[PDB]
Amino acid sequence: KIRDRLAENIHELWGMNKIELGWTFGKIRDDNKRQHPCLVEFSKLPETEKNYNLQMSTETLKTLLALGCHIAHVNPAAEEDLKKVKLPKNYMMSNGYKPAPLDLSDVKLLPPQEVLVDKLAENAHNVWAKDRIKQGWTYGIQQDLKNKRNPRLVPYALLDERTKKSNRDSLREAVRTFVGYGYNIEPSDQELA
Hints:
Largest sheet: 2 strands, parallel
Radius of gyration: 19 Å
Number of strands: 6
Strand content: 5-15%
Keywords: RyR3, Ryanodine Receptor, calcium channel, ion channel, membrane protein
Number of helices: 5
Structural class: mainly alpha
Organism: Neogale vison
PDB class: membrane protein
Name: Ryanodine receptor 3
Order of helices and strands: HEEHEHHEEHE
Entry title: Mink RyR3 in closed conformation
């Protein structure tokens, strides 16, 4: 069920951000007027976008579970206290689609949960790097399409600040979304190998 929630919420994070970038809504995709046909509600989303969001949430949940974290819905009452951010009129599109992000400004994460966010960012970086290497990409300062050179193909301790920061903030928002629905994100107790 939370897999059916975060996949919506990330799409919500996909919505208003495209409003901040200046994209408009239209039936035909066009980058000149910045019209994207996927700026609709999750029920009206196509099967490809819905499956992509579900697979992203599934991979995030599997990455969290592979660390031994115990996910349980111990306190559902916080879901009763969970609300959504009421965006102003400039976030309204031509079809009336207003994205509804969760009100997670009062949701705080533990420093162990921040360590979990950092580990999730490291795992996402490793997955992306392995996918690029499997496509024939190598390390290179100058990026060109013919030679397949990627400057970000580096150990995570030496990456760019903003490149790590954006993914860290996205996964922190995902963990806040997980906490706000009443799911406990405590890790495994067995860590003394």
